[PDB]
Design a protein around this ligand. Structure first.
Ligand SMILES: Nc1nc2c(ncn2[C@@H]2O[C@H](COP(=O)(O)OP(=O)(O)O)[C@@H](O)[C@H]2O)c(=O)[nH]1
Ligand SMILES: Nc1nc2c(ncn2[C@@H]2O[C@H](COP(=O)(O)OP(=O)(O)O)[C@@H](O)[C@H]2O)c(=O)[nH]1
Ligand SMILES: [Cl-]
Ligand SMILES: [Cl-]
Lengths: 178, 176
């Protein structure tokens, strides 16, 4: 309610993936909450990698963005309006859980932030009319844009993600990967 | 490429208006609210944006006017629409108790840089709003006990608000 808190839990199935739950102050006006402080959450990235980049992704119902990643970028991801099927893919070839995945259904009603290490596939599906997706990026030097990221097809038969659609709205990048 | 326009207010010195661009397509929009690279020259050496908050409010909620002695704030509305009102609460400023309104929404995605000792307020004109707020400060977070409050309808300030009957916290009522 009053003092800022975070519950932090490692994924039981994907090493290095973390589920962060903030508390909220709630009254008749709505809610206040802290998505991030340096003091509480800077330790979940290795020495002198700093979250230094904040992005919003506004998406319509049935949009699916993914599956995207790169070797530089730690991501802290949540949904601050509406609802998403957030799916993290293990893309580490050395990992026992290579090309396995974990889904989190994230909304203000279940306000979780997911921490992905680098070399992980990031994706989400918008299950609400509209969604606002918030994420913090931690990386050294220059942002890795689309041409330098990898792409796996949302419906890659090796990964076999459970999505609640057969007909998602996709970018040409995310269609090409099919 | 990630673009930010940085413009100083024509009304309140030290208040900056930051305008991002967006990638817009059939899916919606992708935009960057903040990078250390582009926006850290807006606060002094040694002082970092290190704290990210969200305020979810219903239609006709007014929160404000709030400030403190040390916090730099970068504020915007990422969903719905707010009348964002910055009040100059610096007594040594020539524009003490002047104000500037920004009607912020996804269709006008300005982020407002407030220095310390400024009045921060917003009114929700949409059914719901998501207010996003980055804080830059040295040391420990200043909570409500260590904040000043000016009344939303203080006649010395005379803010143009869309209503005479907003929904207010006990704190923002006391200030009246
Ligand atoms: N859990 C949590 N509570 C908060 C946070 N920020 C403020 N509060 C609490 O919510 C109440 C209202 O704070 P205030 O700054 O007066 O709220 P405002 O009217 O939205 O500006 C106080 O009890 C605060 O301690 C936060 O980030 N997390
Ligand atoms: N202006 C701007 N463009 C961006 C941003 N992030 C991505 N883009 C562009 O948006 C398009 C889609 O990017 P991508 O990373 O493929 O989007 P996703 O499929 O939603 O993850 C590309 O042309 C990118 O260069 C941003 O923060 N700002
Ligand atoms: Cl991503
Ligand atoms: Cl404030």
């Amino acid at each position: 309610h009053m003092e800022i808190k975070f519950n932090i839990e490692e994924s039981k199935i994907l090493n290095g993936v973390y589920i962060i739950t903030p508390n909220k102050f709630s009254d008749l006006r709505g809610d206040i909450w802290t998505a991030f402080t340096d003091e509480y959450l800077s330790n979940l990235v290795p020495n002198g990698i700093k979250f230094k980049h904040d992005k919003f992704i506004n998406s319509h119902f049935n949009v699916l963005r993914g599956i995207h990643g790169d070797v530089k970028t730690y991501k802290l991801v949540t949904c601050v309006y509406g609802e998403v099927h957030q799916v993290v893919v293990d893309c580490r070839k050395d990992s026992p859980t290579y090309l396995k995945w974990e889904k989190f259904i994230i909304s203000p009603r279940n306000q979780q932030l997911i921490l992905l290490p680098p070399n992980m596939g990031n994706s989400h599906y918008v299950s609400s009319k509209e969604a606002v997706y918030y994420y913090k990026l931690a990386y050294e030097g220059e942002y890795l844009d689309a041409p330098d990221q990898f792409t796996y097809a949302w419906n890659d038969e090796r990964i076999a993600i459970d999505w609640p659609t057969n007909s998602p709205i996709l970018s040409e990048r995310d269609i090409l990967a099919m």
